[PDB]
Amino acid sequence: TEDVIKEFMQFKVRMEGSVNGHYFEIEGEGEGKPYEGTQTAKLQVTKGGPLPFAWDILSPQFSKAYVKHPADIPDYMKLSFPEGFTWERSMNFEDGGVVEVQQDSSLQDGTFIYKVKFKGVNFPADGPVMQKKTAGWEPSTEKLYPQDGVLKGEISHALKLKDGGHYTCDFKTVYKAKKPVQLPGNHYVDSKLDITNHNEDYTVVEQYEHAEARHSG
Amino acid sequence: TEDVIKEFMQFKVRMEGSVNGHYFEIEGEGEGKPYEGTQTAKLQVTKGGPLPFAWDILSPQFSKAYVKHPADIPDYMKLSFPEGFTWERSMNFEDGGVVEVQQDSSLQDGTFIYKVKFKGVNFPADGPVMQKKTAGWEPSTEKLYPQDGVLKGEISHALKLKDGGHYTCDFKTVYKAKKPVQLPGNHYVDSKLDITNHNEDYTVVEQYEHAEARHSG
DSSP: TTTSSSSEEEEEEEEEEETTTTEEEEEEEEEEEGGGTEEEEEEESSSSSOOOOOOOGGGGGOTTOOBBBBSSOOOOOHHHTTTTTTEEEEEEESSSEEEEEEEEEEETTTTEEEEEEEEEEOOOOTTTTHOOOOEEOEEEEEEEETTEEEEEEEEEEEEEEESOOOOOOEEEEEESSSSSSOOOSSEEEEEEEEEEEEOOTTSSSEEEEEEEEOOOO | TTTSOOOOOOEEEEEEEEETTTEEEEEEEEETTTTTTEEEEEEEEEESSSSSGGGGGGGOOOTTTTTTTSSSSSOHHHHHTOEEEEEEEEEOOTTOEEEEEEEEEEETTEEEEEEEEEEEEEOOTTTTTOOOEEEEEEEEEEEEOOOSSSSEEEEEEEETTTSSEEEEEEEEEEEESSHHHHHOOOOEEEEEEEEEESSSSSEEEEEEEEEEOOOOO
């Protein structure tokens, strides 16, 4: 990968989507140290704004070539290049919210290109997401296992709620390489995603993640 | 220090302090994996509550024996035990709030004890601390270096504001071991302090830190 994924790598994204009908179009840029598990992202609502829901349901959809892997642990999403990989995710929240996401990752001109497609459905409108009472995602840990010749990962995740409580979402995600690649083992990735800046409308937002692969206790 | 510091270790803390003349007494507890850089803390306002200011100015005072070091970097804090270490900090906010902190660290019955004294003054009375408008410390990195047989450390920190605005602070900390210990080197350490849980009135709050040592770059 030394030759395809370099110590610093830049990326661009476009997301088409809808939460409960509301269509939005977002267009973003990022850049980061991939072998160190640290990335950044600048985003902008490019149609739909002000978005009538929480950025957080959208946050973990704006980069797993940038996960610090040990050398004992193999980096599926890095060795997936220059060809790429795709993930389709299901997020089940407690109030009944359901986000289903599909994404295509590409490498062209030394820049990662990411095309994301998002659909939110049946979100309680007396709930945090639509009432915008969420305050960042709590730190997280995901268990990554292989199955059916692809890599699968689950999270039992909670969103920080403004008052002081949580909001439980369950992530299942499948990753598949556009080419044939050796699958990692039963491993776990540890990560935190932060909104570091924004405007009052969340029509422009700044983000940062740190992710490291590991084993179990 | 593998006879004094264990893979999993627990701590207790008492903070007495003053903000703009107000007096508060906190008492708390934590645990964590000191060789993984991770740790959790549940505190409580035991006198002075509801606190008339932002918890964030208090977050970084309630953990450097909880920082993952490389082998090439020497852990001054882990080696300052069981006799322990002392530290004292200065925080200068843009608006002109000054916080000077002092703390004593000791290990008794293999439980860390912390005793914090904190004195906040000249906090502007229409500012993002006295109007509780802050929403998290931004991720940071500390320029740790030696001077006068002690360890000093600088941070150009920022606080997140509930409108997308950051709020600048300026950390200077001095670390002193109650014993003779080899001083480390010109190094940098990264961290992210998350308020994971909390009650409405911030009379009960839960915290999380991740902290890993490194060299420049």
